């Protein structure tokens, strides 16, 4: 029939066109060489605890910074109230409150948390690298792209950045190493 045959030819043409178009939009996706996206062993190895440590991985920096008491007390003295993101973005644990006890890090295979904190050095606003070394209006990190003030533990404050600095999955290698991945 007129209608059936004509419309079916059109439908088949459309289907073939789409099957040909999809790969032109698929090739731009991450290729297998980008699929890898594996782990990195960074050795703390006495870098003079308290200033900072940055390492490249996955194309983004991974901040490993020891703790300075003044920085710590400022951290532990932050009630969940008035905290933009209280989710403790760290993926090594559940959505537990963004508390310094949970938010600092595992305990060297020992029992202590207020001494090391390794987070992803990527601003949640649009992915810039905040400046460290005690900066901003909260004694933490400052993003120069739009002005987002981070706190000691990395929780976002005073800016458009919606959430704090995430924490990747990491465990220790018996007191001198870090496993990122």
């Amino acid at each position: 029939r007129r209608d059936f045959l004509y419309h079916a030819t059109a439908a088949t043409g459309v289907v073939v066109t789409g099957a040909a178009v999809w790969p032109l939009i698929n090739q731009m996706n991450a290729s297998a060489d980008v699929k890898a996206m594996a782990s990195i062993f960074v050795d703390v190895s006495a870098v003079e605890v308290g200033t900072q440590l940055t390492v490249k991985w996955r194309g983004k920096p991974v901040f490993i910074r020891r703790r300075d008491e003044k920085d710590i007390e400022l951290a532990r003295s932050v009630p969940l109230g008035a905290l933009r993101d209280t989710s403790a973005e760290n993926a090594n644990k559940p959505g537990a409150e963004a508390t310094d006890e949970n938010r600092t890090l595992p305990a060297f295979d020992g029992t202590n948390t207020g001494e090391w904190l390794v987070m992803l050095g990527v601003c949640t606003h649009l992915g810039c690298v905040p400046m460290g070394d005690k900066s901003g209006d909260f004694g933490g990190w400052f993003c120069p792209c739009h002005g987002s003030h981070y706190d000691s533990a990395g929780r976002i404050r005073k800016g458009p950045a919606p959430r704090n600095l995430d924490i990747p999955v990491a465990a220790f290698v018996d007191e001198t190493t870090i496993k990122l991945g």
């Binding site: 731009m28 996706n29 991450a30 996206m37 490249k56 996955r58 194309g59 992915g127 400046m131």
Partner: protein, 423 residues
């Protein structure tokens, strides 16, 4: 009326055997002897400027691509190979880089000339639509291009102006990864950008094809709210040689200034940090993407829930429309509303040379544009936040509400007849 004067192919046997391919018929009848009014000021030249600048950019780019190597490890080195070894080098690069600046400067004056003399008003909607489409294409082009040197500003500008697409929910990260070729920026992004950057200009030329086809079918706007009175038209001298020569004179002046810049002030419009190689591990201070995107950058980074006029706290009614998405929508709307203008101005009138209130509001708009340009570079600390919010609010207010109210109560002026204004 609309005298085409096809020339009847009566010249000679050469002009008679050309009845196989009409081409010269087209040129003569239409694109050279196109009746244009006499009342044209010096604001109707910038289209010739834009065409020439586009040709210049295309040429210089085709030349550079003979020495640029798209790769993270060999881009900077190739750029220096250009500026040092190649015979002309610095010239091509400075002419390419700065000419983009002139291109955008010229489109700004081309556009604001239009907003004044009702060139968006009917029956000239298609030209406006095509022009906004172009503007978009050329913005994307310049963006893709600022990345190729793989300096330091390249990386971070790309980073943020791609995190935008990722702000939106559900389909943000997918688009981000599909555009960057991966989670973050690397050589794949560079290849995409080079290809794309080496392809869109031709689309622009075609769109310029339609741009020129439209306003030849539709008469050029004129300083007055009047047409060429087709019904024989002692007004409306032709294009060649009069306006051709006028435009070429202005173009010579403009190129003179442009080359003076290129030769004495070439690194002025640039960012020095783009002369240091990239470090994905260290971000410089005041990225300041460029100068032809500061308006929208500011409209973006203004809405942050930091003012009593903060509509973000109200838009939070829906848990999905956060701040970032709100700013992105605000920018896209800042452009979409400029495109929608011709259906917002509810006036059966024309050029604001006979609409005073419109004059005042329009000069305020120009000032707002300049202010936004100056604010995108300054931090988000008080007082600049209030300034940016005010300016964006006025932009939207103008384009949404102001024009209807005028079209309602804005006719205290005697319109001029007889486009032959022998004053």
């Amino acid at each position: 009326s609309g005298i085409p004067h096809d020339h009847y192919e009566p010249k000679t046997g050469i002009e008679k055997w050309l009845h196989d391919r009409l081409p010269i018929v087209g040129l003569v009848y239409d694109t050279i002897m196109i009746p244009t009014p006499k009342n044209l000021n010096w604001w109707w030249i910038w289209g010739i400027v834009l065409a020439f600048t586009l040709v210049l950019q295309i040429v210089t780019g085709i030349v550079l691509a003979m020495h640029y190597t798209p790769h993270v490890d060999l881009a900077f080195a190739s750029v220096e190979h250009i500026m040092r070894d190649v015979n002309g080098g610095w010239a091509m690069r400075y002419i390419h880089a700065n000419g983009a600046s002139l291109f955008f400067l010229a489109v700004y004056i081309h556009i604001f000339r239009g907003l004044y003399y009702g060139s968006y008003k009917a029956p000239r909607e298609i030209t406006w639509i095509v022009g906004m489409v172009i503007y978009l294409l050329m913005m994307g082009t310049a963006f893709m291009g600022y990345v190729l040197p793989w300096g330091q500003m390249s990386f971070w500008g790309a980073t943020v102006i791609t995190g935008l697409f990722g702000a939106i929910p559900g389909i943000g990260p997918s688009i981000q990864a599909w555009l960057l070729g991966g989670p973050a920026v690397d050589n794949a992004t560079l290849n995409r950008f080079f290809s794309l950057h080496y392809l869109l200009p031709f689309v622009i030329a075609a769109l310029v094809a339609i741009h020129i086809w439209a306003f030849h079918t539709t008469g050029n706007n004129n300083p007055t709210g009047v047409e060429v009175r087709r019904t024989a038209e002692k007004d409306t001298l032709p294009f060649w040689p009069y306006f051709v020569i006028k435009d070429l004179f202005a173009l010579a002046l403009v190129l003179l200034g442009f080359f003076a810049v290129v030769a004495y002030m070439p690194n002025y419009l640039g960012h020095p940090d783009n002369y240091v190689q990239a470090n994905p591990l260290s971000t410089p201070a005041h990225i300041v993407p460029e100068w032809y995107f500061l308006p929208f950058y500011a409209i973006l980074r203004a809405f942050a829930a930091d003012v009593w006029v903060v509509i973000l706290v109200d838009g939070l009614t829906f848990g999905i429309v956060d701040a970032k998405f709100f700013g992105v929508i605000a920018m896209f709307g800042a452009i979409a509303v400029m495109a929608l203008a011709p259906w917002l101005d509810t006036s059966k009138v024309r050029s604001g040379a006979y609409r005073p209130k419109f004059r005042m509001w329009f000069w305020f708009l120009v000032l707002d544009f300049v202010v936004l340009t100056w604010v995108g570079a300054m931090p988000t600390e008080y007082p600049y936040d209030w300034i940016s919010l005010i300016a964006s609010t006025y932009w939207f207010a103008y384009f949404l509400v102001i024009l209807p109210l005028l079209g309602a109560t804005e006719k205290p002026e005697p319109i001029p007849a007889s486009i032959e204004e022998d004053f």
